[PDB]
Amino acid sequence: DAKFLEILVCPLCKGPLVFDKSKDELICKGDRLAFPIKDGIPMMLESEARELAPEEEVKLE
Ligand SMILES: [Zn+2]
C-alpha cells in the first residue's frame, strides 16, 4: 500500500537534523535552518525552512 516514508536529513546539505521538542521543529545546525513539523509530519522542503535567530543559535552552542 502507498505510505508516507521520508528520510530525515536536511534537504540542502543532507546532514542530520536536531529535534527541538519545544518548537516541534527539526534543525539543521550546519545551515542554521529550522524545518517545521506539521500535523506530526516533518516538512522536508527548503521553502518551508526558517532561518534561526542568533538568540537561537546559542542553545545549540
Ligand atoms: Zn543542512
From Swiss-Prot:
Q: List the disulfide bonds.
A: none
One Pfam match: Trm112p
Under the heading InterPro entries, the entry gives:
Trm112-like
Name the source's superkingdom: Bacteria
Might you report a single GO cellular component term? cytosol
Which family, according to UniProt?
Answer: Belongs to the UPF0434 family.
| PANTHER family per UniProt | PROTEIN PREY, MITOCHONDRIAL (PTHR33505:SF4), ZGC:162634 (PTHR33505)
Give the protein name, as stated in the record. UPF0434 protein CV_3345
| Organism, as annotated | Chromobacterium violaceum (strain ATCC 12472 / DSM 30191 / JCM 1249 / CCUG 213 / NBRC 12614 / NCIMB 9131 / NCTC 9757 / MK)
